[PDB]
Write a protein that binds this DNA or RNA. Structure first.
Length: 94
RNA sequence: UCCAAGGUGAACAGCCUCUAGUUGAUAGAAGAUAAGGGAAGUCGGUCCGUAACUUCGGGAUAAGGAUUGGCUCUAAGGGUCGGGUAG
């Protein structure tokens, strides 16, 4: 990454598992200008639509959750585990 | 010789009911258990607590909460248009 001049490790399975900001004072992407007129307005439009695309991805994630292998059973198991763990989280302290 | 509902049984079975048929058969009155001994007899004694898993399609392309951008060569990857200074 230092060879290529990058200042942030791209999100990869390899980076997360086998190994962020290379430049210690981080730089925000909001003030980073594309310098190309046609794509600058597209970037600003996408920035103004951050919450909408985030919610689209959230709904996609929920629908993927409900379509996984025996999802209702998984939610049931999460319910049981959460109840038991949150009961022990106070029963041990008391 | 023909037709042939459902539920439990969760082992053909048995039990109960739906549709449909019966109330026929003179009427009234008034096997089980057992203390102690133990053959002394006789011919002859499916349901409560775990964990991993686990079904169909569509998807190709390394993943699928995150900052997605993802190899080399190899047919096509919607159409079109547009290039300077001087005489």
């Amino acid at each position: 990454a230092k060879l290529y001049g990058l200042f942030r490790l791209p999100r990869m399975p390899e980076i997360t598992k086998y190994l962020n900001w290379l430049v210690d004072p981080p730089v925000n992407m909001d003030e980073y200008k594309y310098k190309d007129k046609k794509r600058e307005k597209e970037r600003q439009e996408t920035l103004k639509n951050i919450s909408l695309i985030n919610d689209k991805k959230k709904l996609k994630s929920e629908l993927k959750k409900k379509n996984l292998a025996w999802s209702d059973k998984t939610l049931t198991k999460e319910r049981k585990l959460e109840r038991k763990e949150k009961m022990s989280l106070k029963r041990k302290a008391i």
